[model samples]
Target: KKWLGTPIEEMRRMPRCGIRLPLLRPSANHTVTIRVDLLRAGEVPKPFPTHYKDLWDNKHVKMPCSEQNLYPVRTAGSRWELIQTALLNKFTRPQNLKDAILKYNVAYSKKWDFTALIDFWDKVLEEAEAQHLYQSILPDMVKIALCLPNICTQPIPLLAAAMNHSITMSQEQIASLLANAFFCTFPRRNASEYSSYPDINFNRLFEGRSSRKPEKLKTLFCYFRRVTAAAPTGLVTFTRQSLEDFPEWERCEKPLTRLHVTYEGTIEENGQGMLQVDFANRFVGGGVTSAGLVQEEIRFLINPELIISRLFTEVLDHNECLIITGTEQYSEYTGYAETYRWSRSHEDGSERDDWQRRCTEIVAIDALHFRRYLDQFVPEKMRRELNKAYCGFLRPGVSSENLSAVATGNWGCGAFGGDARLKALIQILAAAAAERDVVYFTFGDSELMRDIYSMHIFLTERKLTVGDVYKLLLRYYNEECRNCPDIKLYPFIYHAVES
Candidate 1:
């Protein structure tokens, strides 16, 4: 029986009051309360169309600190004095304050002002009733600031070496690092110039409109509460995977197992206990720092801890991906974009691994952003996508052994203009190459679920190798370039099989 052909309603919906389905489920059968047509038209329903435009609105907006640029070119003497006073008053340890100043100097070269930054944070604390937590949070933030590894302190060899290696840290440690990010303290973070690590800052998180402030605060405070009460004994490993030699697609002979498709639930929610894919930008957090709120932004909002990865992650190359294991999801959210809301705290029930970390693992692989639709049909671009997914799917030092199924949906379809059917085929090819299973979410696209199911069945029954599929794709691409009438992938595959 083709499970993909099973009747399923819109997976994405708005719940009335507090009624909502479980995030983990076999299939979704709920009708969407929001307009599905709008989504199909590329607008995000209502209340939340798209926030990409607002990202740069605060660029010229000044903070209340000194009437200077929100990020000043130089810190005035008076401003520096004020920063010292705030640090001394907030932290009990003199060494902590000294170390924070030293680190700030290293990052900013004494050109930025922290007094105004802390003052802004004070308002943030006041809004959240988190004033009591500030004293402790401030010191931890300072300690994390001192330990932040960047281009200046970290050698090129270390960065390259870290690509394949994993760095394990505690949830509490992540909280400390995130606190520094919350306060916008990382040095050279906002630079626009291209470098190994692109200049990214958290200023946008702090500069949004007042109406959204409460929601943002609630999410952050919930995380603060969890970490402060009794930091989980959990440890998360951040691993960067880089591919020097691309996987030979034509040589892959492995067969795929246990393929399932659904048009419901998010990868993070439904794919629980499985490897989740974060459809990311080349620079880790996508446009979360500047209002690009789609799949990645929603993921970061609910699990705010993931935002800390942006502080240290370098700009991603085409063949590289970042894998995070054991990061906890703290908040529940409803809606997307402008309609996006913080629902409540989430109590994750995922089992722990042998390393005492949660079994939750996320792989962030960026899809190619095609400027023109035809650009994606190019063989080189298709290979790049194949290699990127393979790198993410391939486990280091463990080939064809104990590989877990991947849970992903609509990768690069949103904001990236990728063809959904094309991306799905690419994922299946990559998973087959790595000898893994796939549980794909269509995110409310029932037609896609059905088509993918048929395609999978057709390919498997024919006993086609990965090379065979590539040859088929090549023919399909040439036909597509010729603007043939058969634009769909499933039909083309069926015709190819029949021929």
Candidate 2:
């Protein structure tokens, strides 16, 4: 009952006129068309192509080293030596590492029924040796594992309606946090029947058979070296925004200004400087550490820093969106899932914002995952989708003149079982509601690009208000219920409006 009339109220409060109105004006030569050639997408950089050995041999990027690297060490030796080497090498303190391991073992074993602490260390030692990693690395991993719980205790603040600030941190801080995740130190982080944490972990990043571990390590070590060496002044902020009060989708009278549909490029690559959309899950990185490997998972893998959001972010409400500012992209990647690889390091050249954070702002909005295809046509579901997009599109204290166009495409259409056209239309409507332009990437879906362009043209010609479209959407839903064959949203709307 609370959610019922909210949309109606939202519509009534929309701006009566705005800059977007001009784009709707029809002319002999002014047809709003989709640009297929603009979809220039690229892949993540692949730094190391051959093997893990390239990490030490590569001279262009220096790997951080210490006395531990020069000495011969063994896994079976006294624990103090390993601990001492970590301290000597600036990995972590003995006290912190010990405390972290104890906490980690308690949580991990309680759920999985593992052996005592001694057995756990023994297993870790065995695995490190099998992987041919340095014996001293074990202690460093232990120190990182210990640091996570303490950080998680004071996770980043959520962006509520009353609070509009962001938490900014440096590259060094991000590396430190990610190091904890790399070691799987976070307590109660893994998925459980009683826990709400997304089933994600960093173990896969370390224990994969894909021969990418060395490349991954090199990228990470390079980051650590660079950060520890200079302590980068560049900052990143993680801000979460909730749609406690969103504009009504139906009452929105804003028209589209600049809209483009492309069939190429990932959001991050092409959406630079604009508000890039993350097709995320309720828990953020959905199963990136586990088996889930779609858009969200692939995104996390390339920019591993994003995984840290999992440490503090609560399960996302449909009306909420998480925005990240200035988080640098470390590794470049190609392919997805089985073909996924840790290509190499990337230097993000994007300009810095007033906060000294990079001008990169990514908005994480999860799409509703429909089980039965027919269920998506329900009026309630449509309203929910519209509200979600609106929340992401609505920027605080920013006017349309200053606001950049949103860069997004096929949000929630991958594993979420959402219709591409429907989702695209939802985004267009939401963007319109916010009086923002949209630069949508179809990720090479030429057919969808064509359909969306045609639909935009039709909607523009009629000078359809957002409310007009919303009502038309309802009519389309009813027609869909009758099992109409030519029930595509764009064509359906065209005919509906024409009739």
Highest TM-score model number? 1
What tens-digit string does per-residue lDDT give for candidate 1 at 391-431? 88887565443455778877889678899988998998988
Candidate 1 clashing pairs, residues 3+ apart or interchain:
48-338
Specify the poorest-scoring 10-residue window by lDDT in model 2: 1-10
For model 1, the local distance difference test gives 0.61
lDDT of each: 0.61, 0.57
How many steric clashes does model 1 contain?
Answer: 1
User: TM-score of the candidate numbered 2?
Assistant: 0.69
Q: Which candidate is the best by lDDT?
A: 1
Q: Write the per-residue lDDT of candidate 2 for residues 243-275, one digit (tens) a residue.
A: 677666667777754566667777788666777
For candidate 1, give the lDDT of residue 54: 17
Q: Compute the lDDT of residue 18 as modeled in candidate 1.
A: 15
